[PDB]
């Protein structure tokens, strides 16, 4: 259903344009959340299919980045704060985004609440909103204040409460697993797990002697989709510019030994997480379409029976209805 939905959504916007109405589908946004240093950027960029999110040492997501994807013929990017700037090199794009974060916070443990605004045009995407958010913490590191936790936490909470927010729930191993920022937020919005996949990352770095075994066996609090684990890029990995395919290879090794996950091994990996999330998205789009269709029918009728000599309506309305119908049938 995702595959057939994509083209129909663009077509629907065009019909709306002709009516001269401000009518949009308002595609739901997806937000990635997780502890400090979680691999948050890695997860998000893997879904998008591109290297464009800054990654570094220590604190990585240091400013929220609100990216709106725009269907367009040419492939390029532009910043709100950099009016008119033309790249054309996607490796350069990545670099520029990273640079802007350094601009305000430096690379010495950072933080700023001011969003970076980026528009990435592509002809193979939904007009979506994705958000990279600062890592929530429990104890201060570097020069961060004692109340670091409370500043960061608030910031990301404004995005994840939005109805229909696919949560990329990343959970850091350097914090207690039961105290998981990811699992907390994920459970709050979508308790039954139609679109929540509980993901525990960085599993190879967990402190000796702790585990979430009952929860992770899908028995303690059973979820329809269960839990899928992943092992993303480590500190050495990010430092080196280790590329996307490589990161997946490290995952395999850990999972064979961990008691809480070996029986569920066939329902593990990044790739499996991908499949589930897409399905939910489609549902929202369709639901809004019946309402419009009906309005259009009513307007036409009146003038026709008294034929007002305002025959211009006839043609405009007819067009809109056809587009709507096709999406409704799927």
């Amino acid at each position: 259903s995702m595959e057939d939905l994509i083209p129909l959504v663009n077509r629907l916007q065009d019909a709306f344009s002709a009516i001269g109405q401000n009518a949009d589908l308002d595609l739901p946004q997806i937000a990635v959340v997780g502890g400090q240093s979680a691999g948050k950027s890695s997860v998000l960029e893997n879904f998008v299919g591109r290297d464009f999110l800054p990654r570094g040492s220590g604190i990585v997501t240091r400013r929220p980045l609100v990216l709106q994807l725009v269907n367009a013929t040419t492939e390029y990017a532009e910043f709100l704060h950099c009016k008119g700037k033309k790249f054309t090199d996607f490796e350069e794009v990545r670099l520029e985004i990273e640079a802007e974060t350094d601009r305000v916070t430096g690379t010495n443990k950072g933080i700023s609440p001011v969003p970076i605004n980026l528009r990435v045009y592509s002809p193979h995407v939904l007009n979506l909103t994705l958000v990279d958010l600062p890592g929530m913490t429990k104890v201060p590191v570097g020069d961060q204040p004692p109340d670091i936790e409370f500043q960061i936490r608030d910031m990301l909470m404004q995005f994840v409460t939005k109805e229909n927010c696919l949560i990329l729930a990343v959970s850091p191993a350097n914090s207690d697993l039961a105290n998981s920022d990811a699992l907390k937020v994920a459970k709050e919005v979508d308790p039954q797990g139609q679109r929540t996949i509980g993901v525990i990352t960085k599993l190879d770095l967990m402190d000796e002697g702790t585990d979430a075994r009952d929860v992770l066996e899908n028995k303690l609090l059973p979820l329809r989709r269960g839990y899928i684990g992943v092992v993303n890029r480590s500190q050495k990995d990010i430092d080196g510019k280790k590329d996307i395919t490589a990161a997946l290879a490290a995952e395999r090794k850990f999972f064979l030994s961990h008691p809480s996950y070996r029986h569920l091994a066939d329902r593990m990996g990044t790739p499996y997480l991908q499949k589930v999330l897409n399905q939910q998205l489609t549902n929202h789009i369709r639901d809004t379409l019946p309402g419009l269709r009906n309005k259009l029918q009513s307007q036409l009728l009146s003038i026709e029976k008294e034929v007002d000599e305002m025959l211009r309506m006839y043609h405009a309305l007819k067009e809109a209805l056809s587009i709507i119908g096709n999406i409704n049938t799927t």
Partner: peptide, 21 residues
């Protein structure tokens, strides 16, 4: 009332009668 009934006679003045614009 009786005069008001008289307008109905002309069929081909039908569509010619109707417009409401």
């Amino acid at each position: 009332q009786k005069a008001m009934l008289q307008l109905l006679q002309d069929k081909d003045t039908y569509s010619w009668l109707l417009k409401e614009r």
